[model samples]
Structure formats: structure tokens, C-alpha cells
Target: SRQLVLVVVFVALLLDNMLFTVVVPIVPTFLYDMEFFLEEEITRVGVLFASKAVMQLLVNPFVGPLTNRIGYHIPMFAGFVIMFLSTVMFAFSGTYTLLFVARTLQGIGSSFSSVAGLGMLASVYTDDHERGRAMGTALGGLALGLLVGAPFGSVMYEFVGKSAPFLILAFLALLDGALQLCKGTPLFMLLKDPYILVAAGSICFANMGVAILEPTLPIWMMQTMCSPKWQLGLAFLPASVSYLIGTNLFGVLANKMGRWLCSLIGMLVVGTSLLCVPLAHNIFGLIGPNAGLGLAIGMVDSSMMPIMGHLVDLRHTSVYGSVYAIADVAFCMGFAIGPSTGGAIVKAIGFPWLMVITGVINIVYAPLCYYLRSPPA
Candidate 1:
């Protein structure tokens, strides 16, 4: 039964992940292809990336309680429909403005779908141990989607056409919606929990770190080390592998040590790692810190859902949605600021000192994670 749910959620999340990741490698190229964007408009691309997060922030607050009051199925279905439409728009988008609007729509759809999916996952799984495994598996699908989608999307654009990937994603979103309609559950009990707000905040910070690092690191590496294109894949691989290992390992650890501790430690590690990134002089210098950061992400990812499950009763799916929305917003803000901040800092004080400052900030935030507490359901 758990396995079946895992399979379903995995497929749903996989499709979502594919849709999200497919754009990563292609976005810069796409903007470049558009005659109107101009070379100086690169920062606009960051704004484009941030646009989705902004939409999520705008919509997420209402999504959670709404999901709680109504049900996960309807909202989830609606979200998928919106996502499909957004993808279609993106596939045919001719201008930067159109692309920006399409991306924002995609973000809204993603917010709804993700809220519903996560709420559903929490509602269905009862055992803490099993829940950890299930969440881990679902997250693994997300990671796998990123790993596969980046390369696949790149290759697909090379052979078929630039828009082929988005078109394919639209079809996949449609299919996912159909499946969600068939198998989805309606969660109505999540509104009672107050601790969810704190959890949401924690999630926001965690994702903020993620958003900041992903786009910024490559640029930093390129500037400092003249790293090759393949180095992008290499830099991320260690973290990805570390994340996989850390999440699974920390899942077990959470069971033994308690969720709060696990989460606190994980957050601290991640912040520290982010802070350390600027300190590295060469590609090799990044490995240790990146691995540490990955471990932190893994720990947080592994523990967060279970912690959420513990925090809310079965009725408050909407609260979960809201929490995710806040996190999504933070992710957007972080991504938008992280690279620019890093770049500016590097320009002022050089790379080594910039990282030191970032690291200090992370270390300061680490203790703040201890404030997260399990809800009494």
C-alpha cells in the first residue's frame, strides 16, 4: 500500500520535476535566441526565475487553508490544468514578456500542485519510519528529474527544436492531472496547527539557501577558476550524492535523535556550507563544503515532512500548502539576491572574503533552527 502511494507520488512529482528542470539549461539559451532581450538583459533572466517564486508567494498563503477547507483533489487538479496551460504558453512564447508571464503562471500552478501533493503524502502515510522512506523516495524523484532533465532537455533542444521540451512537458502535465484526479485524496484537517507557520519559515530559509547557491555558484566558479562547462555538472554531483546519502542517513537519525535536532543540525550545516562557497579558490576546494551543504539539505529534506506530519493533525492540509508557499517565496527571494550579492561582494572584497561573510551569516542562522517544534495534535 505504501509502495503504491510512493509510485503514484513519485510519478506525479517526477512529471513536475521534469517540467521545472527542463527549463534550467535552456533558459539562458532561449533568452539569447530572442532578438529583443539583448546581451545586457541577463539580469532579467534572474527576474524571470524569481517570477515563479513571486507567484507562489502570492498564492501559497490561501492555498493551504483552502486545501484544508475543500480537499486536495480539486485544487491539485486545477493546479495541473493551469500548469498545462502555462507550459503550452511557454512552448509558443515569442517574446520575453510572454515568457515571463508564462513562467509566472507556471509558478502558480506549481504552488498548487506541490501543496496538494505534499499534503496528500503527509495524510496517507501514518508510520514515521515509512513516511521518511516515502518522502525520501519522492524527493529522490525530484533530484533524479533535475539530473536527467538538464541533460535531456539540452539534448532535446539540440536535435528536435527549442520548444520541444516545453511541449512535451505540457503533455506530461495533462497526463499527471488525469492520474491525480483518479487517485488523489482530499485532506481537510490541516488548519488546526500553528507550528506549521514556524515550519514554513524554516522551509523558507532552507530553500533560500538552495535558490541562492544553484545559479550563483557557477558564475562564481567561472569567474574565479575559469571552470569548464562540465565542471558545472561535477560541482553539483558531489552535493547531489551527498544529499541522497545524507537524507537517507538522516532519516534514520531523525528517528533516533528526534526530528527537531535533525532539522537544526541540517540547517546549520547548509548555512555554513553556503557561507564557505566564496572561500574556495579552486574547483577542488568546493568539494568538501558542497558535500557538507548537500548533507545539510538532505537532512532537512528528510526530516521536514515527518516533522510536518507530526505537527499537524490529518485535517490541515491547507496549512501545509501555506507553509510551502512561504518557503517557495523565500526560495525566490534568495535566488534573486544570492548571485547578485555574491557578484557584488566578489567585486568589492574578492571571492575569499565574500564566502567568509556568507559563511558567517549561515553560522548565525544555524541556532535559529532550534526554534522549530513539533505540534501537539
Candidate 2:
């Protein structure tokens, strides 16, 4: 039963992220091709991308408590319905307003599904070892969804009608919900605990590192490597691949070696990799360090995620919705802050300096993980 529940949880997270990312390529192209706005095109496109995050951020607080009240199944299933409607709206919408609304709805759906899905996983897998592995698998689904989403949108848009991609994805959304037929916080007082804060903070910093790289890396690569357009997308592949490996591997390892030790090691790797990132002169040279950064991020996340659940078990009631919602908040905060902060830092001091600064920060933070050790009492 848990196996089936895992599958459902995995697919829910996978499809929620797929919808978020799938629109990135398609929506901008659609606006440009349709000649929606000549002067305001870039602003509109940026808004479209940011809207989902904003909505998800706003919805997180509410969704957390509601899931606690009603239960995971209702929120998760409701999220699927909302996402399905958003997909359908995307398929048929030719107007900018409709598209914006669809994107916003998608954000709400993402909030519900992600929080509910992860909350369920944390509740289901009581043991730390199994919990880490399960969360890793679910997170991998998220990574896989993001990795494929853009290409899936691009390919479908190129081969079929513009609406075809959403139409198909909408169908999948419906199926994703149907398949779930099988199964499956409080900020102030909780945050007062050192363990919760460190776990949440580690997740935030780990995500912030990747988010910084996402926007700045492409520009750096293009300038130094004189890379072509296609290479820009592929550059992230090594990181994503290694991230998948690191998540699953460290997920298992956290149980054996202790979560704090794993997190400390990962942070060291993360810092070392960031320092290495600016040293690469060519595309291939970037791959090794980029992969290391991804792996390091995975390691930190795998350790911290289960650590969050374990803290909840130790310190509070068994309700998982609020705690996981806190985790989501950490994740979104990193994503929100990273790009803007990175962009400004890059503009001011340049890319290499930014990388070096981030590296140093991570290294300085490494010792903090030492405090993450738990007592078996």
C-alpha cells in the first residue's frame, strides 16, 4: 500500500512541477510570435514566470493549516483539479489576460500539491532511513519533471499546434489525479528550536546556491566560452543528472553516517564546487564543478528534509502539513531571493566575484551543520 502511495505522491509532485516549468519556453514564444506586445514583451514574460512563485508563496501559509484540518487527500486531489483546469485554460487561451490567470491558477495548484504530497510522505514513512529515501525519490520526480518540462514544451510546440502541448499535459493531469485513487506547522514556537531552523536554513541556502547559478551561469558561459544558444540549456544537464545521483545516494547514506555529518560534507563540497565554477574557461570545464554543486545540493537537501520530519516527531504533534509547509517556504524564499540577489551582485562585482563570494559563504556555513547532530533519547 505504501508503494502505491509513493507512486501517487511521486506523480503528483512530478506533474505539479511539470506544469510550472513546461510553460517557460512555450509562453514566451507564444507571446512573441503572436506579437502580443512589442515594448512590454519582456516584462510580460517575466511576470508570467514570476506569478506562479508569488502565488505559491502566498498560498503556502493557508494550504498548510487547511491540509491539517481537512487531510492530505482532499488538498492533493483538489490541487489536481485546479491544475487540470489551468492546463485546459492554457490550451485554449489566446488572450494575455487568460494566460496570466491560467498561470496564477497553476501556482495555487502547485502550492497545494507540493505541500500535501510532501506532508503525506513525511507522515507515511516513520523511520528516518525510509523517510529520507522516500523524500529523495519524490524530490527526484520534481527534478525529472523540471528537466524534461521545457524540452517537452519546445518539442510539442515545434511539431504540433501551440495548444497541443497543454492539451496533452492537461490529459496527463487528469490521469495523475485519477491514479491517486490508491492512497495517501506553526512557525514561531517550532522555529525557536535550533534543529528546525538549521534544517530549514540549510534547505534555503542550498536552493539559493542553485538559483544563483541558473541565471548567471548562462551569461558567464556565453561570454567566456562563446557558446552557442543550444548549449545554454544543456549546460544545466550535468548538474541535474548529478543531483539525481546525489539525492538518492545521500538519502540512503544519511541513515548510516548521521544526517549532520552528511550535510556538513555536502556543504564543503558545495563550497569547493562554487570556487571551482569560476575557474572554468570552457564548457566542459564547467561540467565537473557544476555536477559537484548539484550533488552537494542534493546531499544537503536529502539530509535536512528528513531531519525536519524527525524534529517534528521529537518536538511536536504528528501533524506534518505545517512543518513541510515551512520547508516549502524555505525553498521558495531561496528561489525568490537568489536570482535578484545574484543578478545585482553580478552587475556590481561581476560573475567571478559573485561565485567566489558565494563559495566563501558556503564554506563559512559548513561548520554550522555540526550542530545538527541529534540525540537518540
Candidate 3:
């Protein structure tokens, strides 16, 4: 039965992440196809991403308590329905308003599913060993989705066309919904815990560091390398590829290092790697730093999630849904803040210095890991 929980999470998050990412690589092309709607395709794409992050911020915190009250399957089932409709609606979207609505639905669905899925893992895998592995493995499905979604969507768009990929996404979401998964015990507000607060803060800063690069990276690449769009696409590959490797391996490592030290070490690696990225003037120079970034992020991400579960473990209560939901608020906040701040900073100071500043911020964030000192209840 517990094993079934892991499967549910793995499949749910995999689909959730896949739907989120599958459109990314094709956004410009899709908008080009829809140019009849209006101009400012870039703004539309930005809005699509922002809507999801913003909605997640608003919805994730509530998702936890709601999960506690109603159980997991229903919320998650509704999430799948939302995602499926969002995908289909986007595929048929001829109007900008329709696309906007679809994107909002996508965000809402992602928040519900993400909070529920991780909560499921946190509740079932209570011990350090199982908890660490399960959280990391479940998130790995998300990473794997990123790994597959990018190239797969791009290829599908180029060959079969845009509608095909989204329909595929719709079908995938449907399959996920059909599973109907299991029920979770809700241990419902986590804000009172000092230990949890610091942990969430550290993860937020780390994520913010990562998110800061999102809006600026392409422009930075074009400025520094005079690279083609394809090269820009290639530039993202090393990070995704290495992230896939790092998450699985780091999960194993987290079992040995204690999640705190593992996270600190990972942060150090990411900070150092961020500094190194700006040093690369050409495309090939980027490969190393990007791979390093992926490796380091995977290490910390793998640990940070399970560490949250363990903190709740220390309190001798189980509210997997609630803990993950609250943690997601921090997670979504980092994302929401990162690109907006990064874009502003990039405009003011330029990209290289932006990397330097974010690097310093990440390095400074390392001490928060010490807060993971609590024992499992």
C-alpha cells in the first residue's frame, strides 16, 4: 500500500512537471503561429509563466489544509482535470484571452497536484532513510519530466505540430487522473516552527538564485556568444542532463551526509558554479558551469525536500500535505521574486554582475542548514 503511494507521486509529479515544461520550448513558435491574435508574444509567454508561479504562491498554502480535510485523491483528481482541460484549451486557443485562461488553469492545477503529491510521499515515508529517498525520487520524476519535455516538445512541434504535443499532454494527464491513488492523513499551520521556517527560507533563496537566471539567460547568451537560437537551446541541455544524474545520486548521498550538510555542500557548489558561468564568453565555455549548476541544484533539492519531511517527523505529527504546501509557498515565492528581480537587476547592472550578486546571496544562505538540527519525533 505504501509502495502504491510512491507510485502515485511519481506518476503525478512526472505528469505535472511534464505539462508545465512541455510548452516552454515551443512558446515562441506557438505564438508565431498565433500571431493573428496580437503582438508582444514575449509578454504573453512571460505572462504564461508568471501566472503559474503567482497562482502557486496563492494556492499552495491553502492546498495543504484542504488536503488534510478532504484527503489526497479528490484534490489530485481535480488537479488532473484542470491540467487536462488547460492543455486542450491551449491547443485550441485562437484568442489571447483563451490562452491566458488556459495558462491560469495550468498554474492552478500544478499547485494542487504538487502540494498533494509531495505530501503523499512525506506522510508515507516517515523515517529518514525512506523519507529522503522517496522525496528525492518523486522529485526526480519532475526533473525527468523536464529532461523529456524539452526535446520531446520541440521535436513534436517541428515534426508533428504544436497541437500534437498538447494533446499528448492532455492524454498523459488523463492517465494520471485515472490512477485515483490513495488517501493521506492530514496533520494540519507550520509557521510556528523555527526549524521549519529557516529550512524554508534557505530553500527559497537557493531557488531564487536559480530563478534569477531564467529571464536573462537567453539575452545574456546572445550578447556574450552571438549564439544562434539553437545554441541557446543547447546551452540548457547540460544542466538538465546533469540534473537528472545528480538527483538520483544525491538521494543516495543524502542518506549518508545528513540532509543539512548535504544541502550546504550543494549550495556551495551552486554558488561557485554561478560565479563560473559569467566567465564563459563562448558557448562551449558554458557547458561546464551549467552542468555544475545542475549537479549542485539536484544535490540540495534532493535533500531540502526530505529535510522538510523530517522536520515534521521531529514534531511527531504527520501532515505531509500541509508541510509541503507551506514549503511550496516559499518555493513559489522564490520563483516569483527571482525573474522579476533578475530582470530588473539585469537592466540596471548587466548579466555578469547579476550572477555575481546572486552567487554571493546563495553562499550567504548556507548557514541556514544548521537549523536542520531537530530530531525525528
Candidate 4:
């Protein structure tokens, strides 16, 4: 039964991540194909990408309270519906403005579904130790979805058409919605908890760093090191392996050491790793730091959801929604800012200096992690 639940949840996450990753590699080509958006539209495309985060920012705060009042299943189902509609819209969009709107809708849907899914998972695992493992497995699914989806989407676009990916995504969304409906769980109760809020703050900071790295790191490697595009995948391999290992291990670690301790340790590792990246001269130099970052991320990722579950009692819909909203918003903001800041620093000083600055900022998180506490029982 545990494995079955994990499989269902993992599939749901895969569907969600598939939609998210399908757009990453295709965005540049999609914009290039549209004649009007050829050269000057890179900025527009960036904004469009950021717009999803912006929309999430607008909707996430409200999703929490709303999910609290209603049930997780309804919101989860609605999220897929929104994603389906958005993908359909994307498939047919003739103008940049229309594409932007579609992307924004997709973002909103993703935000809600992600939150609801985590909350629902929390409800399923009654034991604290089991919750940690479940959360790790679920997150592993999310990571795997992105890791595979990007290349798969790129291949589909090359063989078929640019819009083909979106069409496929739309179908997946519908299937996911249908599956969720049949397997929906009952509404759990919510607790008047404050620990969830604290966790949210920590997640916000940690995810901010992650968001910053996702887009910027690739750009940094490509531009600064003049590394071949294919090598980019190799760069990420260490982090990916570390993430999987760390996520699975941290669950057990958290159970033994406590969530707060695990989180603090994770943050420190991540911060230290980020500080070290700027010093790396070759790809090999990055392995240790990337592994550190991945381990930290995995630890926090595995621990936070279960911690929220414990804080809010049986019903976690609202708390989950609100917490995700906060984290996602921070992530979005960081992505928006990190690239530009890193670019400017590189332009004025150099790659080494820019990395040093990022490292310093990341290191600051260690102290901040000290303040995070698990919700009181």
C-alpha cells in the first residue's frame, strides 16, 4: 500500500514536472520561430518566463486559505484543469501576448497542484519516519521528471513540431486530473500552527538560491568558461546524484536528529557550497560544491513537508498551499534578479568576483538556518 501510494503520487508529480520542463529547452526555439519575436524579443521571452512566477506570486497566498476551507482533491483537480487549458492555449497561441497569458495560467495551475499534492501526501503518511521517506520519494519523482523531460521535449520538438510538446502536455494534464479524481483522499483537518510559517521562511530562502542557480548557472558556464553545450549535462550530473542520495538519506537522518537540526545542517552545507562555486576552475572542481548543494537541498526538501504535516494535524491543504506559495514566490524573485545581477557583476568585474559575491550571500544562510524550528507538538 505504501509503495502504491508512492507510485500514484510520483506519477502525479511526473506529470506536473513534465509540463514544467517541456518548455525550458523549447522556449528559445519557440520565440525564434515567431518572426515578430526574433531578435529584440529575448527580453520579452525572459519576462514571459518570469510572468509564470509573478502569477504564482499573485495566486499562492490565496490558495492556502482557500484550500483550508475546501478540500485538497478539488484544488488538485482544478490545478490540472488549469494546466490543461493553459497548454491548449499555448498550442494555439499566435502572438507573444497570448503565449504569455498561457504560460501564466500554467504557472498558476502548477503552483496550486504542487501545494495540494504535498499536503495530500502529508495526510497519507501517519508515521513521522514514513512521512520523511515518502516525501523524499515524491521529490525524487519531481527531479526525475525534469531531468528526463527536458531532453524528451527537445527531441519531440525536433521530430514533430514546436507545438506538439504542448499538445502532449495538455493530454497528460487531462489524464492526471482523471486519475486524481478516482484516487482522491478525504479532507484532513487544519491546526492553528506557527511552525509551518517558520518553515516557509526557510524554504523561501533556500529555494531562492535554487531558483537563482537553475537558469543562471547554465548561462554562467556557457559564457564564462566557454564550455561546450553538451558538457552542461555533465556539470549537473554530480548534483543530480547527490540530490537523490541526500533526499533519501536525509529522511532517515531527520527522523534521528530532528527536522530542525537536519534543516540547519542542510542550509549550512548549501551555503558553503555556493560560496565555493566561484573558486572552481574546471568542471571537476564543481563536483564537490554541487554535491554539497544537492545534499543540502535534498535534506531540506525531504524534511520540510513532513514538518508541515506535523504542525497542521490531519488537514494540511491550506498550510501546504500557503507554504508553497511563499517558497515559489521567493524562487521566482531570485531567478528574476540573479541572472541580471550576476551578468552585471561579470561585466564590471569578472566571473570569479561575481561568484564570490554569490558565495557570500549563500554563506549568510547558515546563520539564518539556526533560527528555524520545527512546529511545536
TM-score of each: 0.71, 0.75, 0.78, 0.68
Q: Candidate order by lDDT, highest to lowest? A: 2, 3, 1, 4
The sequence of per-residue lDDT tens digits that candidate 2 reaches over residues 334-377 is: 65666556655665576778778877887887888777686443
Better of 1 and 2 by TM-score: 2
lDDT winner = 2
lDDT of 1 by residue, 312-369 (tens): 4343433323334334554555655664454445445554565555556656655665
Top candidate on TM-score is 3
- Residue 375 shift from truth in candidate 4, angstroms: 9.5
Candidate 4 TM-score, C-alpha based:
0.68
Model 3, poorest ten-residue lDDT window?
37-46
Ranking by TM-score: 3, 2, 1, 4
Which residue pairs show collisions in model 4? Answer: 188-315, 189-315, 275-359
* Of candidates 3 and 2, the better by lDDT: 2
Model 1 clash pairs?
Answer: 64-318, 188-315, 189-315, 189-316, 190-315, 190-316, 190-317, 191-316, 275-358, 275-359
Candidate 3 has what TM-score?
0.78
What is the Cα-based lDDT of residue 299 in candidate 4?
86
Q: For candidate 2, what is the TM-score?
A: 0.75
